[PDB]
Symmetry: D3
Subunit: 270 residues, 6 copies
Amino acid sequence: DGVRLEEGDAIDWIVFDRPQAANSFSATLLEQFSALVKDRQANGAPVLGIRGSGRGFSSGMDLGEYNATSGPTSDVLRLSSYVERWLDLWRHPKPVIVAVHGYCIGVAAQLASFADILVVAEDAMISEPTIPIGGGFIAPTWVSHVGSRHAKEFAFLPGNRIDGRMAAAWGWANCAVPASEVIACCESLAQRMKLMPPAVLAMKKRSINRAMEAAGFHAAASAIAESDALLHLEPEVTAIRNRLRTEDLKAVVGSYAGESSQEIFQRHGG
Amino acid sequence: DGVRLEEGDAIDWIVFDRPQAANSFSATLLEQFSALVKDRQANGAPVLGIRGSGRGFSSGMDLGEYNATSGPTSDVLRLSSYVERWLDLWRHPKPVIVAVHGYCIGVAAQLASFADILVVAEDAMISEPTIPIGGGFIAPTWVSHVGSRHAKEFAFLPGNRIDGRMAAAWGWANCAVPASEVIACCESLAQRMKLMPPAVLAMKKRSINRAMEAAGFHAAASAIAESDALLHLEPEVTAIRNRLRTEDLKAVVGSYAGESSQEIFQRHGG
Amino acid sequence: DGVRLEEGDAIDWIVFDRPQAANSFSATLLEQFSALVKDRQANGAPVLGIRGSGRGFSSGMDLGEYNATSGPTSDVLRLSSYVERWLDLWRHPKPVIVAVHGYCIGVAAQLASFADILVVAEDAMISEPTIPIGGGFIAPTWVSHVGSRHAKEFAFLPGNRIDGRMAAAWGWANCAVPASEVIACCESLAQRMKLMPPAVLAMKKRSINRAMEAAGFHAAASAIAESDALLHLEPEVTAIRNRLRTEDLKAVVGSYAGESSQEIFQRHGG
Amino acid sequence: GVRLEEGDAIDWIVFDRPQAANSFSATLLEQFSALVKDRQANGAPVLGIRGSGRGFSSGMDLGEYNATSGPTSDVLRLSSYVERWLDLWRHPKPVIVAVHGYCIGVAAQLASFADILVVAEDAMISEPTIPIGGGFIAPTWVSHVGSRHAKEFAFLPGNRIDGRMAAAWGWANCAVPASEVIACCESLAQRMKLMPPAVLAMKKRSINRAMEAAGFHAAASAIAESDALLHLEPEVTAIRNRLRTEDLKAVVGSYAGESSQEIFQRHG
Amino acid sequence: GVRLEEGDAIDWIVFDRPQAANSFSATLLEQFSALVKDRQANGAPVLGIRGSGRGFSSGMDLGEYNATSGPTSDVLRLSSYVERWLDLWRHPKPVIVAVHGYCIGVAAQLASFADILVVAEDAMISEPTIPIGGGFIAPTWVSHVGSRHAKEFAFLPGNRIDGRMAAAWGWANCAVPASEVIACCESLAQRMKLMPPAVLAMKKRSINRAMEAAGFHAAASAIAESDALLHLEPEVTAIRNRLRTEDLKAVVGSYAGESSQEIFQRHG
Amino acid sequence: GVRLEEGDAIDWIVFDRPQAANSFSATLLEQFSALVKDRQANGAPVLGIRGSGRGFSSGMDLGEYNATSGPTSDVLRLSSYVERWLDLWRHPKPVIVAVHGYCIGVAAQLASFADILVVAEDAMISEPTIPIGGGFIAPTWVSHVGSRHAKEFAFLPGNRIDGRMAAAWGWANCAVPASEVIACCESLAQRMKLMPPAVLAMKKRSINRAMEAAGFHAAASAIAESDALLHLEPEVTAIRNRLRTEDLKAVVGSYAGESSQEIFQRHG
């Protein structure tokens, strides 16, 4: 568990609800998430929505999901399994709307790249993982939404982060609204979508997805798992991870944390 | 007929001129349109322009072009024939500039996706078809211009619509100008283009088109006809179409019409 | 020579420094440029930067690099060799940051399309070649950054040009900053990037590049050389080039120079 | 109607519906996929697929098509079949398919997503006997046999080739006598068993990326739509009505005749 | 120089220019396309293409190249040929091409965009005899024969294969005796006739999407440019000038010799 | 350990390291690339590659792998090999590869980026004898042989085919007797010599664009990553440790056995 379904007449919400862990993803959460997604294929409201309870959307993957001992291929298959759970959103017969408020970190920002429609709080924080313990996994899925210059900007600075406004301006989100209006905004869109026959929604979505596929959407994801798994085995990365065995999390993060690229541009008069 | 050619020294305009039907497309109009496009390959001015007479660019396809009795494949081939007429713009040796004012609805917004340069009136209305009688035909051709988030937003709400400013901001148009300056703006661009040797214009265009093709532009269109033809056969769609046999058009539209997605975002503080 | 390396602790700059020719590219400059790029693969700072000395980034290719007598295939191979030197930036294991101030003309604007991160002076001038002596070479490499409408706009008007602000807004640059802050801005980004292990930077970049490749990035460049080489042989182009044999450069440019597309849009109320 | 036969080099998933010539039903297919998933991390290092009895499979049972659910619901059903086959392609283990006797319709689609395909010399690989659909099976063959043979296969009703032909076209790795098909696959698997499983898995992912770069995944992206459209053509629904109202043999008998390869042979 | 022979299973478009060995002129090609378009919704369910007399076609007549119009005008002319062939590929009916005797140059490009290709065992499929161009024909073969044979074909002047070889390479579906080429295509068409036309059309569109996903359409996107560039190489214009000023046989005689496959045979 | 033998139709780059069975070292490879680059605009119109002595090449020497440099450094090393082979593919001259005796591992990757490939009937084309990597060589074959044979090749340890098989699979243009391999390539080159070099160069670029449109370049974009991951699997590092600590023959002897094609033959 750690995931809840809130039914409604226009949109059913899948809600991450692990307050104790800032809605971070575990293997168990993910199994339950996929079970809901599948169940909502033919049950419930005509739109499917995803959001977080509490203070933020999701802090990303629990660090303890990574297991060094199982070897690199087993890591490749684990990471790839995550991408397939997100591709179930893309293949889904209903429109999938993702509502992000507060924090959206790491692999949670990968999930959201596979939504149909993405509405973000103006003040949300969309972030790379805070410590450079991996890579080549999230930002590549942003390329078709934001282009390669911003994807590379996002990826190349440790703990880089943008706000909802910036995510909308880059093209990652459809629109940034005040935090208090995020849910109601999605509900308003869904109430209009509800007037369409579900078969219409489904075929409109399949047909747009073929154009994305033609533009490389699916093949873009074909080696990101390998990329990230290789980095989990670099010695300089296993040493950083070892710092976690001894020291406080905040101290390790603290040696990487600092200005984001957008803060640097603003400071220099952009 | 219903289409006119207005020759000029920098740009020849193909002009939709069916006032009685709000410049909507019929089989006859389309044959004449393609004949002009072909004739302008080697005759006339160095730029080709497309625009509407009167109150708007075009209201789209006449409803009566759809014929249930001929079967689905015959519908696929009809729809596909439309896409090929638009691809003639893309393959054309001259720059093709499309000037939109007032309304640009349905299949007319598909046409305009295959222009080289698109100039739109700030106050134009670019719209999906008003009743969800089809789908998976127009928005997929927008993906390479606006991305998948806005294409899906545009597609998933019945009668969704944006203004010229929004179309420019999404990347669908090059620029939005006041309605009174649309034509003169295109003429000004064309007067500069005129200084280039025509062979230069032609090769610059072919070479950019290869990069689009590499990015999936042509393959993106390969099943949109099938998508739309399938929807024309859904029972829930044939029932809506049957409402047309009995009731006033305005009453049927009226049960689908309402706020656009961009109006919803504005209302919620975007 | 005409290229210099300025080492630093976060970023090493490759600096074009041919004041006598406005940092224009010659065969010799290009050999030295590639030698530096290669040497910086495993030596020096973790980020590689490219910029110009003096008044601007680069005025592009020396006209005298084109040799009519060697035939079209030999021209194809020369032009293609330029593209491969730029692809070495894309394949490079370090982040490559390009800093543009003042002018960035012709083939120099092609180079910059293969950078990872591009920072431009607000007041820089990014320009097509001033006389239509070629084509189908630069703008096709802009398509994945700016879309096909702006690429075609840029290409179809002789000597078309945009400023840094516009280049940022189109998506060609990451950000436009005042001229005096361009270098320091790049240094600030690089100081953050420096905290990442180099293997991380390298794999993040390879993985993003696979997503670009999936979207056609590499295949987009496969015939641009052919396109440009064909145009060098059009009679109307060889006549313009012949005007150079007799007349002042400024007189020939002067018959093509004029308003840019963006100036035309502004004049018409965009 | 599916069972698992475990072994030390290869586990076989075995279609076993003698009453229906190993044809596929929604229930069979759910069980098939549950086995494929289970074999991801359990059992032998190779996964095999084959049929019990007289043939591999006669394809979909006709009753899976439901006119009543509408075209999109049909698209989603057909697409769900393709995804079951893509599970083979995504699978961490080599997937070997062994075909004997008949392999008809959608069962010949399934086999296009195997890694290795061993066919009985004798086998009959066939389009559906009656033209009640299309654009679903042959497009998945293009990658293996080229467009010429895929179009030749698709454009004649009940077209069919034997195992030898399938091997020569490139659809099978090799054609062997019926009595050796299983033992041949076990022999291959015994050699594959010497490789670390992680090696097998990665070799397969890397080859799959080269297929994907060559269009493999995108080539399947509208085949469901194509077939569902044809289920609604008036000429197809009239043929379907013949089936509901005359003897199957009479309807088949109206379409049956020489295969393309028999035509080529006859003309030298 | 083209005619239509109607039939009940297949209508044949027949090149018939005996005085020029069925070579293509701008006038022939306009008439060819007008027939292809007409046969979209009229006549028999299959469309055939073939040549009358001694061969399929000797290719483009040399006079279609005009140095005077400039390179871009040349690119547009060559590209217009490719679009005429793409009309076959887009066509709602199966397109069967029957080749006997000679099939040279651009006529061997045309035949790459047929659905089904039946060749006389005897036929000669040939690159142009003199190297006056390039990069136009063989790239359209890659999809059918692979890059190795396409490069082997393209890199030797006047390289040529027989029908058997073309079938073994994958360019033809099958090679039969010359006297059976037509009757073979009619036989196939009589079976195809039993399928509803809508079924044929959709089967073909769906297979074409799998080709397109595999690069088929994009593979043609710069072949016009490649060939037009070579029409302007000094070494090519000097060969062309030999043609304007010596006997054709003398110029050909300077390039003619063993084909690649004759070389391989000779070396065992 | 590489030399250049100049000729008037073809210049041969010749691997010549008898002490190491023409295996590749970083020094060999730098010299190989310096020759390939030099032959861009110098010498004969065709470039050839071959091995001196008993075989083409045994592949990479094992000492090029350095565990100490980390995985990314390994990815960059493997990728640098692929780029050396892509220089052949980008090269302005036809590149003909002649293989006799053994062609193992990465040497069988190299040969996939030749234009024309002539193999001795006799030759042994082999995966590495011990499974110490993967996902690097076979993915480059898919384009030439299809996914079925590429997977068959990759999934069995030390799998191997002879030249005949390589020709029948499509990896080689043709298999000839060992004593004719060179003279066969010279014969082809003497015909290619009659073509203007500019023609050859453009024919090749245009065919390469059709390959690229079919995925050729993108198919190689993660093979380095795949192989470098497998160099870090515990089961692979244990096999590698056997090599550092037992006789090579004992370790090989644990994996050696029937090839897939021997298995198919044995089963009829």
